[PDB]
């Protein structure tokens, strides 16, 4: 575990993370995809061998010894708000299990279902609160990666508000 487990947020490409493993905002079919998923495919393409996994689940594949945790959030274009909310919470619970199993001291994580899978809605708070629900009982240092300047400020505020 980390000596004083923390949450942090950085505004940069999660492919450049400084953590012991990465969570991919994966599609169910293990395809290169778009956004975070394409950056992850360019950086760790070896991790997409047999990475396909259903919605609401996480599947880890090693790139050398570097673990890539493929977490499949729901696409809110296809799911009802209710069912999508349940699957988005479940994906993060499976990320917490994998992070624990791997014995890492740190993890780089994007906000699942907030980009192309958002169904055109702002899901920062929804996705971040499910991240916290899952990760709060883990002792890894969590570093959240985002690309938007206003999202960085809002994520930072939410982290600092609970300290």
Q: Binding site for ADP-D-ribose: residue ranges?
A: 13, 27, 35, 115-117
Out of 42, 148, 153, 157, point to the residue binding Cl ion (CB under 5 A): 148
Kindly indicate which of the ranges 1-9, 58-66, 131-139, 141-149 contains the residues binding Cl ion, using the contact rule CB under 5 A.
141-149
Residues contributing to the annotated binding site: 13, 27, 35, 115-117
Out of 1, 6, 12, 160, point to the residue binding Cl ion (CB under 5 A): 12
Residues whose CB falls within 8 Å of the CB of residue 107, separated by 6 or more in sequence, listed in order: 19, 20, 21, 22, 23, 69, 95, 99, 140, 141, 142, 143
Residues whose CB falls within 8 Å of the CB of residue 116, separated by 6 or more in sequence, listed in order: 34, 35, 75
Burial of 109: CB neighbours in 10 Å, binned 0-12, 13-18, 19+: buried
Determine the size of the site formed for Cl ion (CB under 5 A): 8
- Enumerate residues 13-52 that contact Cl ion by CB under 5 A: 13
Out of 66, 147, 154, 159, point to the residue binding Cl ion (CB under 5 A): 147
Q: Is the dihedral of CA 118, 38, 66, 49 positive or negative?
A: positive
Out of 43, 151, 155, 158, point to the residue binding Cl ion (CB under 5 A): 151
C-alpha atoms less than 13 angstroms from C-alpha of 124 in its C-beta half-sphere? 18
The minimum distance between CB 146 and Cl ion, in angstroms, equals 4
Site string for Cl ion, 81-120 (x = CB under 5 A): ----------------------------------x-x---
Planar angle of CA 33, 96, 123, nearest 5 degrees: 55
Q: Is 144 in the site for Cl ion (CB under 5 A)?
A: no
The residues that touch Cl ion, with contacts defined as CB under 5 A, are 12-13, 115, 117, 146-148, 151
């Amino acid at each position: 575990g980390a000596m004083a487990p923390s949450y942090r947020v950085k505004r940069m490409d999660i492919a450049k993370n400084d953590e012991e493993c990465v969570v991919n905002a994966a599609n169910p079919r293990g395809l290169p995809g778009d956004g975070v998923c394409k950056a992850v495919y360019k950086k760790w393409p070896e991790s997409f061998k047999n990475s396909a996994t259903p919605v609401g689940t996480a599947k880890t594949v090693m790139c050398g010894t570097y673990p890539v945790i493929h977490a499949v959030g729901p696409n809110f274009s296809n799911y009802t708000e209710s069912e999508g909310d349940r699957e988005l919470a479940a994906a993060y619970r499976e990320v917490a299990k994998e992070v624990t199993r791997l014995g890492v001291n740190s993890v780089a994580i994007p906000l699942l279902s907030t980009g192309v899978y958002s169904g055109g809605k702002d899901r920062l708070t929804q996705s971040l609160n499910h991240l916290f629900t899952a990760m709060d009982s883990t002792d890894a240092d969590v570093v959240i990666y985002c690309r938007d300047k206003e999202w960085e400020k809002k994520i930072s505020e939410a982290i600092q508000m609970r300290t």
